[PDB]
């Protein structure tokens, strides 16, 4: 069984840079290496076959090089849509067909400040006995952000769940969705609900709020 090892395991580059991912084999596999690209939430796609042959319809910025043990995928001019995990695969000693561990490509860009939106629980959901208050941060970079919920200027801890997206395929930015969860009762016991967002594109923390039922 031939083990494929990719290097680096995570790579950062800005749009327009040359990217070079390496795949090494435990033992010679001649030109029997294929390169695939998996974009978040999608299935792998064949980019290169036979080490240096481009699958019809794949952009020409992708290129394969190599023979024997050391192989290299090269992206001449990285573009925002090349965000993905790239995998190499050997078809020389089959079975088993073996893949590399994967190289995640992270696109680096300039700072972008989030756009913040607070959303109060819906009347329907309130009739369910639950109350979810949402706070959305939109198109920001870098990924590091802080969402702090405050009910009646009371810092809330243990009731909020967050979820960050993957880099956008056009602007390479992130978005985030924090959600506070109270019981309909608990929600009907307080007045002001706010989220304060901290991000280095904001010159100071940005709070957005709403008043219970004043909506």
């Amino acid at each position: 069984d031939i083990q494929m090892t990719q290097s680096p395991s995570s790579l950062s580059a800005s749009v327009g840079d040359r990217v070079t991912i390496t795949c090494r084999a435990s033992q010679s596999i001649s030109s029997y290496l294929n390169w695939y690209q998996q974009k978040p939430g999608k299935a792998p796609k064949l980019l290169i076959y036979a080490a240096s042959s481009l699958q019809s319809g794949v952009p020409s910025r992708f290129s394969g090089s190599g023979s024997g043990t050391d192989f290299t995928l090269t992206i001449s001019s990285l573009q925002p849509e090349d965000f993905a995990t790239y995998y190499c695969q050997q078809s020389y000693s089959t079975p088993p067909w073996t893949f590399g561990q994967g190289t995640k490509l992270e696109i680096k860009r300039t700072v972008a400040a989030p756009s913040v939106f607070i959303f109060p629980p819906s009347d329907e959901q309130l009739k369910s006995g639950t109350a979810s208050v949402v706070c959305l941060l939109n198109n920001f970079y870098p990924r590091e952000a802080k969402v702090q919920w405050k009910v009646d200027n009371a810092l809330q801890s243990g009731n909020s769940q967050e979820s960050v997206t993957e880099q956008d395929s056009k602007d390479s930015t992130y978005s985030l969705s924090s959600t506070l969860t109270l019981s309909k009762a608990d929600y009907e016991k307080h007045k002001v609900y706010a989220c304060e967002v901290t991000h280095q594109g904001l010159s100071s923390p940005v709070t957005k709020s709403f008043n219970r039922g004043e909506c």
Binding site: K45, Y87, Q89, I118, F119, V134, L136, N138, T165
Partner: protein
Amino acid sequence: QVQLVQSGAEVKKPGASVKVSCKASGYTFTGYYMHWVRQAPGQGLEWMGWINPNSGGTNYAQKFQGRVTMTRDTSISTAYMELSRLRSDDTAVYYCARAQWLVVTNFDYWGQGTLVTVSSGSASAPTLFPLVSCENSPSDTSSVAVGCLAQDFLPDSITFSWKYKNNSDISSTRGFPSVLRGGKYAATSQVLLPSKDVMQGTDEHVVCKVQHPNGNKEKNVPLP
């Protein structure tokens, strides 16, 4: 127009078995090998086996030898993979992949995937609740954000689609990872509508649709 369309996501208890399908189109099903590869959450790709859709022959990987079974039905050009005695380690996305060439075999067409979640929970379709924004200082020239909240759905195989009140599609789908809480998942989608459109328009709502393997659901989201 080569395409491989797989079955839907499934939740199975430990010890159970699952059979996933892969309907092929756009080529001669019997002339190309069909492999199966799986991807655990966050981890890489793992070859499972192949089937010759013409002879019925199979070759599995030792890890799965004795627990997997790959079949085909050439009349419906479909391929099958049944994994039994399911364990948590088997929660993953199972893909079918066509292979080409006989020397440098390469998986040139892949499927969409089929999530299999091995858990103790039960499956449920989502419940949709709208999200309308209520700011302390609404600005006319700023874009208008509306949203949809899906709750209590399992497995996490939801697809949020949005449509205008005039039926046409909304290509502003902002999608966030689901969140697990209480054995069931919850997700949030957001659409940002230009001000040029909500100002100059008299549409009162936008429709949030969600597709889940245990029931598709819809909800109207008011347009402030």
